[PDB]
DNA sequence: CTAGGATCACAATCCCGGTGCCGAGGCCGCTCAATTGGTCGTAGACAGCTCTAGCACCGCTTAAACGCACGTACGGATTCCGTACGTGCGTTTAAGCGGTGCTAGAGCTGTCTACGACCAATTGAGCGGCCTCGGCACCGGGATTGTGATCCTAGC
DNA sequence: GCTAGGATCACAATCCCGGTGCCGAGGCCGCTCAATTGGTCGTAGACAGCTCTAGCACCGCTTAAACGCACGTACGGAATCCGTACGTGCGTTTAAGCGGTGCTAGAGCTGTCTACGACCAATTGAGCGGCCTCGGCACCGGGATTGTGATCCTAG
């Protein structure tokens, strides 16, 4: 499913960052970086889930995981 | 008959996406990716809709910030095109 | 007895002095909480909240809008260097980014 | 099930500063998160300050110092002014 | 005025792992700082975990989860093994 | 009564379980502390200390030294990816840095 | 007193950092950066001192100030 | 007579300072700087010897780290000399 | 035939008035936690004392900083090439929306027991003070390695 | 006869060894205070049971977005040349460092007291979830405006 993050999507993300020109090799690097980030976050969120003896990951678990990784998110209950 | 010079449409797109706020990654693909990744930690895992939305918000924000820093790195080398070496440098300096 | 007068009203505040106090007592911060601490904290929170709402409302009016949305809050936070510093690591959901194009990229 | 929020008080201060301006639900969630975050930062700093000085009680002094440590520049000056005024007014009922 | 430290226990462990190796006072200060820091991190995360789940008691589960959250990769696995073994032995006196 | 047996000895640990328990009760973390928590925490601390000390002693022996100094701690910490990650934002006093010269600078 | 941080000292610091060649303008920039950093740390340390009603800044105050800025220092009592 | 080519002594100095651990700024000037800076916040301030030592130690570590990142930035632009633009970029990426 | 300009054609954009909807914002009852008045004890404020460790000064001794000078090599400007990326069009695909069905599991309530807080009596683990001697830092002087260049040769 | 690659050399810096001596690591001592033991008892959470919500699975339809390809141009990268400015080095200067002496401020500790917060009972009103509704917003079409790329024109 990582290929679902298509090149146009990455282009749009780069455009929001004010980037004008894109190399053909940027897409694979970005995909890898995103994968690593997501792995880290989901690992913390699942740990939180396991501690609460839940079987469904809640928005709170994600918010907390982001907070402890120094990426505090506003708008989802804390 | 009319062809815009390379760069004009790029700048128009920059302005448009920097002015709007909706999420730019397709929802379903992202959801599938999230579920695929979570599978390695626990099976039969369910996800609140808001959990997926929060993940998407965080990932997009992070990636935008990274592209911003990558752009700054590229300009330093008297270039206007970003390549993987720029991302690597940005990440290295950030401590990742 | 006398009519119940809230501690918020005694301090001339809108934030809930009694709830700020309860949250402090049950938040595992200390064995004991002074009487003035909740008042002070509530006043500080209120001031910050007033500031950010004033700036967000100003941004909304400049955008010919009458309701504050996350975009306006991003605009307010990132256009103020002190508030930006305070909220440097924070991500505002649905906030977008500030319009910024490097001069070297212009035609 | 009641979930306590700062929504009412945010709406009240908003009516004081902008009588004709409303607020979306999303912004209301953002504001609640903001308030909760600032609370946690200030209270935690006050707790550390108490522990460092071998004190139990968190008093107005601990809060003031925490505010000075966290709020940058002019935000500290005005926040301190507000807190002092409120405490002074309150102790005299 | 006495000042409690980890000096005796860190020295004992060193003598267990390296019987013929000593340690300087400066390195001893480093070790003390290290222990205090990691004790704070793990206990603080356990406290936050307890609060999140609306629980008032810190048990071995909170510590274990904190250890997984803090220690990267293989550090966590072995630390968890060590903690579980110790708890098991203690419960059987 | 029975001859006093330390909680550390019951768990087969060198770190002080009783001291870890006292520090937990007086550190304003929670209302109650389980009986197993100090044991677990002490065991974890001990394992980490053993690991670091082992790596530092190894570095010392490679330097033909018999006493561990901050330099050996720096070497041990920065040469292990996992330990480096754990201690990323930590400065070891009198540690110095790892010998690293960019390849492009070599003659 | 900022001029007391002489050119050779800055050069030594750069050498520890693996720097081979140094521009002549680096010295003023480094001095400014160092000044800013120091100002921040000293500000926080003095705040800690004043809260304790002391007139001497102790090593602990400095350690705490560095710690809260995410620059934890080992070796000075915590 | 004998003159080492530019670069040889630089590399020797790199090796020497990367092998040693003593503090590289002179103690007295640094102490005077610290006292001058603290004066603007509170008057008649006294300083523990260990406080000053800790400050110096920490400052030198910070500066070394910054020079490391600056060096990495320089190499990216195919240069071997660090200039203010490199420090500025490094700091920007770090968030400072 | 020139460069800069004025003029042109066009697509993308910002603007206005009309539509209509679903959220925001106010009103309902009520309940549970915020308030009032009281007793009790201990944490912190305040005064006094000690002595430690910070500040201030002075005299030598170098080590390092400052200055100046010669030069090479590295930064930077200029030019040319080719290819890789931007732009645009036609095709394909799967995302988004709506609607339905189901059930797992989150969330809440009630019981009860374990096990954690607290106390009194006990005592030995851990503390600071004292002593020592050997691991280390420093020195001299040899062996070793590396940088820079000078001279020689085999082949062009 | 000229050149590249090499052998050979000078000599500077570094690594190594044996001897010196010092002051920090490490152990022993007395003792005290905080860790252990046995016991009481209250409430926090484990466990069981129940409800109802929202997350998952599926299907059809529309259409917007992704994809693949064609074309061209402008940008990255390689190459060349200039020149200045940083590096290495020798000479002069200076002030850091070290050792020593003296003073005193204030940090740390102790004793006493009181006022302040914890805790309780009684009670009442703030603000919670549920409900309703009407106007600010998102969207649409038709328009006026703007900017981009191309063209014809001018005095020169």
Numbering used by the authors:
A (entry chain B), G (entry chain F): 25 to 102
B (entry chain A), H (entry chain E): 38 to 133
C (entry chain G), F (entry chain C): 11 to 117
D (entry chain H), E (entry chain D): 32 to 124
What did the study's authors say about this model?
The nucleosome core is composed of the histone octamer and approximately 150 bp of DNA, which is left-handedly wrapped around it in a symmetrical manner. In the nucleosome, the N-terminal tails of histones project out from the DNA superhelical gyres.
These deleted regions of histones correspond to the major regions in the nucleosome removed by trypsin protease. This fact assured the structural integrity of the nucleosomes containing the histone mutants lacking these N-terminal histone regions.
